[PDB]
Amino acid sequence: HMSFIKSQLPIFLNNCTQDSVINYFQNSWELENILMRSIIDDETFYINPDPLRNPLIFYLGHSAAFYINKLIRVELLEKGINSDYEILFEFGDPENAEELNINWPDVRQVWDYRNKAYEVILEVIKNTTFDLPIHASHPLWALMMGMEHQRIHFETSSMLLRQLPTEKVEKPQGWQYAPSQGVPNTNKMILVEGGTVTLGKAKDNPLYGWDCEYGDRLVKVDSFFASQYLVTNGEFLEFINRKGYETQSYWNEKSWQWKEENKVKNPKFWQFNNGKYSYRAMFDEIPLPLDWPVEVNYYEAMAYCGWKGKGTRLMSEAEWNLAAYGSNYQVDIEKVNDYNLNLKFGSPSPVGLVKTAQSHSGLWDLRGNVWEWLDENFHPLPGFEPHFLYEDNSAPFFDNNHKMMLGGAWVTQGTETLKYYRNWFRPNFYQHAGFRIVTNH
Numbered sequence: 001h002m003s004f005i006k007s008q009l010p011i012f013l014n015n016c017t018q019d020s021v022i023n024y025f026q027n028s029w030e031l032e033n034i035l036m037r038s039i040i041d042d043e044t045f046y047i048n049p050d051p052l053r054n055p056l057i058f059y060l061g062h063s064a065a066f067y068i069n070k071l072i073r074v075e076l077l078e079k080g081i082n083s084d085y086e087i088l089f090e091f092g093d094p095e096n097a098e099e100l101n102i103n104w105p106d107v108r109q110v111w112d113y114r115n116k117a118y119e120v121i122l123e124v125i126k127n128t129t130f131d132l133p134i135h136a137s138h139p140l141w142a143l144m145m146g147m148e149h150q151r152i153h154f155e156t157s158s159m160l161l162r163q164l165p166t167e168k169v170e171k172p173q174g175w176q177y178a179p180s181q182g183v184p185n186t187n188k189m190i191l192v193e194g195g196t197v198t199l200g201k202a203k204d205n206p207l208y209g210w211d212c213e214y215g216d217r218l219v220k221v222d223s224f225f226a227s228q229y230l231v232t233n234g235e236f237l238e239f240i241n242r243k244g245y246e247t248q249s250y251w252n253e254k255s256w257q258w259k260e261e262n263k264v265k266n267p268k269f270w271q272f273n274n275g276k277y278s279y280r281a282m283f284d285e286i287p288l289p290l291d292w293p294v295e296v297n298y299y300e301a302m303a304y305c306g307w308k309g310k311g312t313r314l315m316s317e318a319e320w321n322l323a324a325y326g327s328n329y330q331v332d333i334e335k336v337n338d339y340n341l342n343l344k345f346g347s348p349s350p351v352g353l354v355k356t357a358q359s360h361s362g363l364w365d366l367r368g369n370v371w372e373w374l375d376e377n378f379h380p381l382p383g384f385e386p387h388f389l390y391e392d393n394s395a396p397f398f399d400n401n402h403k404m405m406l407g408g409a410w411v412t413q414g415t416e417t418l419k420y421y422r423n424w425f426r427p428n429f430y431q432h433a434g435f436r437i438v439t440n441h
């Protein structure tokens, strides 16, 4: 599996020494540099490959600016590097390309700002006492935030690069896709015994987390059936061949309108040619990996559920937590090595290939491989409180227009690989995300 490109595991707040944080910081930055350096021509930075997101030049400077602004806010920095850039590269969620649709700086100028910002932050780390443990009311929380924010944008930007033509990107040395064993095994429904789970994260938990992660909610989860694997490309191919995209009964009025307006006939990263479907990995087009989890948005996942019928649905946040972590929990960061997470592979993996990736529930790849959609409107947990460093992180998206996803993907790094991270997206948006199907009986 992908070894030459290595991502350092997250660190508990009680072990965030200066040395370890220096290493984690350097790894966070170098990884984004590798991805950004995969764009061959600088003119390509002014393309917005995703019609719902900004140009790539924005994301070149966004992670660096975020560091500086948060450090300034906690007064670990007395001044920034470029106030204009710190404004331009700050504001990052439209429902249409029209809504989404400024004079951007040159590519060299943004790289220069990145380089200056890196050295500035490194000096802050080398000249600040790391009095253990770090915590939410500690100024260094701003640094923890920036490093996790940079790693999140490694993922979001990977999606942008995937939407660029293959001829405009260059695969980094060591990038390695998972294998394909061909046709997938049978996807059996597994009974997940009912139980009670506690959602949320305590304020004194020794791990960095975003505001929406914190709170406390007990939820009694009734037993339910779930597919042992995420729905595979092969399984979704059947849905297509049975006219899944052409039968309104499987969709709803909102989802059908999306599909028609975007003239969708297949998942975003499939392409039909010569009687066969090709599939777009990060940097190359390859024969469709039939045993990999299918990558779809929420509308498409629900259309598949509609074709399956019989009340087929998606899990709730509580249902996923029960299946993944049970009713018990002390996080063991080393367990991230047991799942397709943290760049073990540079791609999705065949369901069940990572033999260490079966949860005690019997379900495979609940953690890792690809994010999995949930029928759960993004919402606060009892006890939620915005953090002064980033009050608009999650609160504006408690609007019943965002569905959640959990577990992490092959590209996911940092604290986002662990139990408490809560993810969300508009249901039409594409990520490294798939789904599994659920029935109550």
Ligand SMILES: CN(C)[C@@H](Cc1c[nH]cn1)C(=O)O
Pocket (backbone or CB within 6 Å): 092, 149, 152, 153, 156, 423, 424, 425
């Ligand atoms: C979690 N996710 C929906 C955010 C993560 C993020 C990026 N920058 C700030 N928050 C986004 O992609 O907008």
Ligand SMILES: [Cl-]
Pocket (backbone or CB within 6 Å): 330, 331, 332, 333, 335
């Ligand atoms: Cl764990």
Ligand SMILES: [Fe+3]
Pocket (backbone or CB within 6 Å): 062, 066, 092, 149, 153
């Ligand atoms: Fe951001």
Ligand code: NA
Pocket (backbone or CB within 6 Å): 365, 366, 367, 368, 369, 370, 371, 372, 406, 407, 408
């Ligand atoms: Na998953």
